[PDB]
């Protein structure tokens with residue numbers, strides 16, 4: 001049975017309880033924490049690609065007011081459907097299952113300035129989502145897992161001084 005489990009869920013839940021924030025820049029910023037998953041129940045012999053995209057959680061944007069995140073207005077038009085291909089793709093199930101899969105090089109940005117970066121809208125909440133694509137498959141089978149522990153608000157600068165402090169502490 002295919003199981004994709006979140007690594008360092010306790011680390012994520014510490015950010016989530018403050019409301020997690022990720023910096024977006026012109027040139028793209030790496031995530032902290034990095035999304036990491038363990039995989040079991042792939043066909044070790046088969047080849048797969050691993051994809052990561054970011055699903056918009058709400059039909060409104062967010063604002064940090066009086067040390068509280070609150071609904072902050074109507075959403076902007078959905079960000080372009082950007083997909084990041086794990087650099088180990090394509091690869092054997094055995095490869096994906098032998099060690100955690102880390103999305104350490106993915107970069108979040110607020111400008112379509114190329115370079116395999118993911119465009120997000122400032123002050124919108126996103127949920128990371130991993131896709132396993134079997135290669136050479138005439139049915140193009142894909143599996144999708146969402147990671148609710150890893151939800152964050154995209155920000156051009158940290159709003160919550162506790163998040164700024166956690167990011168320095170655990171990084």
Ligand SMILES: CCN(CC)c1cccc(O)c1
Nearest residue numbers: 007008009010011012014170
């Ligand atoms: C947040 C909990 N804490 C100790 C369990 C921790 C700190 C850093 C990395 C990590 O995987 C965990």
